[PDB]
Amino acid sequence: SYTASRQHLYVDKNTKIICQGFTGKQGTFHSQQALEYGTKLVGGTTPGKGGQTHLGLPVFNTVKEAKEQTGATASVIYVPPPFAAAAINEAIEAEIPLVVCITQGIPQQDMVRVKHKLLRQEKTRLIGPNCPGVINPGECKIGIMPGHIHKKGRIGIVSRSGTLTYEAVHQTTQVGLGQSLCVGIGGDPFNGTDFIDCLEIFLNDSATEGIILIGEIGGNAEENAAEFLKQHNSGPNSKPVVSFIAGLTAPPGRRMGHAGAIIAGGKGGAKEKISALQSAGVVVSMSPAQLGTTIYKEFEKRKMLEH
Amino acid sequence: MNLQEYQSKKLMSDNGVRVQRFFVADTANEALEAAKRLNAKEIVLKAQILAGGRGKGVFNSGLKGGVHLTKDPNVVGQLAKQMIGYNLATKQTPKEGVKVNKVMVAEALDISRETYLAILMDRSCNGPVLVGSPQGGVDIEEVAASNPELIFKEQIDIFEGIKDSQAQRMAENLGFVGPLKSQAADQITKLYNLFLKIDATQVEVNPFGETPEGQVVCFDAKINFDDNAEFRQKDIFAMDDKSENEPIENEAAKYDLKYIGLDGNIACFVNGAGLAMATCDIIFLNGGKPANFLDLGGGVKEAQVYQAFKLLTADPKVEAILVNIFGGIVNCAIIANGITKACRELELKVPLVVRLEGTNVQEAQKILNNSGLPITSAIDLEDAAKKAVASVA
Ligand SMILES: CC(C)(COP(=O)(O)OP(=O)(O)OC[C@H]1O[C@@H](n2cnc3c(N)ncnc32)[C@H](O)[C@@H]1OP(=O)(O)O)[C@@H](O)C(=O)NCCC(=O)NCCS
Ligand SMILES: [Mg+2]
């Protein structure tokens, strides 16, 4: 089933990348940053510009063309909302092992159709849309995250918020722990990767010794992850998990930017997610500035720091 | 966005959904003539405002009640004269109320059974779901806590569409019997196709009722629209009635900005929905009250930054401003240029706390360092919240 593609989240130095929307404003700027970061970006697609050259790399009309000619195993999408669901579907049809969609604003009904296709195959793993991407620090950067805040290390981070991902990375770099793999799953209600998907990778990754899970109001994905952690991360060799849930003070009945982020029909509150995660043994930092220090202290108690 | 009742019921009626026959009237005399054109035993007159509680509202002209029933078109016009042009206040409007420019004049209909029926995009189910209950006329959340056994659902495949089998089964679980069941199922089908046609996130009918004469009618309804589909729903979004939205929020929307006004005195200028929520939260944690939520998103242009910053300096409640940017796709230098341009036209007179990190952070700090503005620098999110709370307390 589609869960068989979870492994494709763990990009590394050997992952080669194409960029859909390569020649647009944002595809160009963040492709430049990826190039400077050392990531193996080998080309991109822009229908109608196949054959051209961009940032010193070939442009193709189609994903299948670009995949065959470059051997890319991942794609990142900087396509505008009216066309981005089609772009995702093209990458799925081309059996790109990993697809990351940065685009904000894809109609929910479009993403319903995209998930229908996605769930009925397992060659392609989707991260997003409306997400920052994924990064294996020092090895492979796929998205918009500022490169210079990362340091390869020991903490796996999964977040529904792009900018809170940067905060969690920055804080774990500061306290010296670093990051093993960072996945932003995005703020949209229909997406390709949830918390449990990333927690499976994290719990089975020896490089990942602790986990930061960042969530927010809306939906039940945090409650689901709590139960998954209850059953799969309760042993004596359990990995510490620290979390922050945004929106404790948010007003009810309002979309807080993210389509996903809404307290509706008395469901989706933050404290309910905090209590659920606490019941699973997760340590919830009340302040979003203290994720790094909170997980450092959890490492200290467990005698996990080198010192 | 929001639609008036007459707009949403027209949209439903033009798509085959059975509603109460009705006219909309801009004047009392038009309402009186509308009442005559209906030629119905009884008539309902309804003030058109978006807020709720119209039943118990009171007009600044003295008329108590926004919904009235009468069998006499003359009473309809008499009542309308006290509604149109007059502000209708209710439990969910400001004490001033809402200027009523239109009233609905519709055929009143006896309700012999009330049910609940909705279609929504369900995140858990990964697509559209029919939700129904024979317990009509009450908050569906109250039915789900008291009698969850009476909440029925069907998962609709997005490519296959609603099947007749699913519409029939939901009609039966709602109590519809015999001929009324085929009516109900065909209305369920039409509501579902409408829901897809208009990029709704939810279409909610309550009561989805029967009349003694054997009609299945959607008596009241609420539609929530997917803002992300505006580019392919121009006609519907043109009808958006912003007359009851908070004014600063309306201003921000003109520039593709998401502003939600709160009750505090510390303004927030943040990128990202998560960081923006977390900034409100960490201000509260440190003893302050945030004045607003603001999600600066994606590829911000300098003009948008400039306009968004001015939304904060014009709120009378703001006593300090907290700028907190962690830029990935957002370019910190564009933030810096937009803020400085806004401050050059203001006296300020409010503390300005600034935390910047991420994309092009270095250039942005130079812009701010050369600007001559009285800025309080912050090293991290906790430092920024503590400095913002201190500056006003
Ligand atoms: C996706 C997004 C970045 C694109 O904006 P942009 O880069 O300013 O847009 P542009 O129009 O400059 O470029 C997009 C390109 O896609 C191309 N394109 C269109 N359809 C395409 C397709 N199916 N496949 C590939 N490229 C396609 C266009 O041709 C255009 O390139 P061109 O100008 O060379 O012709 C923007 O719409 C967006 O979503 N921004 C917000 C992102 C965000 O904040 N996400 C959340 C992060 S947590
Ligand atoms: Mg965002």
For every residue of B221-273, DSSP letters joined together read EEEEE-GGGGGG-HHHHHT---TTS-HHHHHHHTTT-EEEE-S-SEEEEEESH
Cα–Cα distances in angstroms (integers) from residue B246 to residues A19, A147, B281, B292, B310, in the given order:
41, 39, 22, 12, 16
Resolution in A: 1.8
Pocket-testing residue among A25, A49, A183, ligand 1, by greatest number of atoms within 8 A of Cβ: A25
Collect all residues of chain A within an 8 Å Cβ-Cβ radius of residue B157.
Answer: 116
Q: Of B271, B285, B374, B367, which Cα lies nearest the Cα of B324?
A: B271
3-state SS class at B90: coil
Q: Are A166 and A109 in contact (CB under 8 A)?
A: no
Q: Which atom of ligand 1 is nearest to the CA of A103?
A: 39
Active site residues of A: 258
Active site residues of B: 116, 204
Pocket-testing residue among B227, B295, B304, B329, ligand 1, by greatest number of atoms within 8 A of Cβ: B329
Tell me how many residue pairs between chain A and chain B have CB atoms under 8 A apart.
Answer: 168
Cα–Cα distances in angstroms (integers) from residue B139 to residues A74, B67, B136, B191, in the given order:
47, 20, 8, 20
CB contact under 8 A, A108 and B140: no
Pocket-testing residue among A102, A127, A131, ligand 1, by greatest number of atoms within 8 A of Cβ: A102
The DSSP symbol for B81 reads T
A105 touches B: beta carbon within 8 Å: yes
CB contact under 8 A, A81 and B228: yes
CB contact under 8 A, B228 and A287: no
Residue nearest atom 38 in ligand 1 by C-alpha distance: A103
Distance CA B325, CA A219 (A): 26
Give the residue from chain A lying closest to B282, CA to CA.
Answer: A287
Name the residue among B226, B274, B328 with its Cβ closest to that of A109. Answer: B226
Q: Which atom of ligand 1 is nearest to the CA of A184?
A: 48
SS3 sequence of chain A: CHHHHHHHHCCCCCCEEEEECCCCHHHHHHHHHHHHHCCEEEEEECCCCCCCEECCEEEECCHHHHHHHHCCCEEEECCCHHHHHHHHHHHHHCCCCEEEECCCCCCHHHHHHHHHHHHCCCCCEEECCCCCEEEECCCEEEECCCHHHCCEEEEEEEECCHHHHHHHHHHHHHCCCCEEEEEECCCCCCCCCCHHHHHHHHHHCCCCCEEEEEEECCCCHHHHHHHHHHHHCCCCCCCCEEEEEECCCCCCCCCCCCCCCCCECCECCHHHHHHHHHHCCCEECCCHHHHHHHHHHHHHHCCCCCC
Q: How many CB atoms lie within 10 A of CB B71?
A: 12
Give the residue from chain B lying closest to A30, CA to CA.
Answer: B329
Q: Are B354 and B377 in contact (CB under 8 A)?
A: yes
Q: What was the experiment behind these coordinates?
A: X-ray
Where along chain A do its domains lie?
8-130, 131-300
* The one-letter amino acid at B75: V
CB contact under 8 A, A287 and B284: no
Q: Of B272, B328, B299, B324, which Cα lies nearest the Cα of A135?
A: B328
The position carrying tokens 């020896």 is A206
Residues with a CB atom less than 6 Å from ligand 1: A 20-21, 23-27, 45-47, 78-81, 83, 86-87, 102-105, 130-132, 144, 162; B 297-299, 329
Architecture in CATH of B247-392? 3-Layer(aba) Sandwich (3.40)
Give the residue from chain A lying closest to B273, CA to CA.
Answer: A257
What's chain A's Rg over C-alpha atoms?
A: 19
Q: Which residues of B does the annotation place in the binding site?
A: 20, 53-55, 109, 206, 220, 271, 328-330
Distance CA B207, CA B175 (A): 13
CB contact under 8 A, B293 and A250: yes
Question: Dihedrals φ, ψ of B104, to 5°?
Answer: -100, 140
Question: Dihedrals φ, ψ of A67, to 5°?
Answer: -65, -50
3-state SS class at B293: strand
Distance CA A78, CA A299 (A): 38
Q: Which atom of ligand 1 is nearest to the CA of A45?
A: 25
A214 touches B: beta carbon within 8 Å: yes
* The one-letter amino acid at A191: N
Collect all residues of chain B within an 8 Å Cβ-Cβ radius of residue A130.
Answer: none
Give the residue from chain A lying closest to B380, CA to CA.
Answer: A289
Q: Which atom of ligand 1 is nearest to the CA of A163?
A: 48
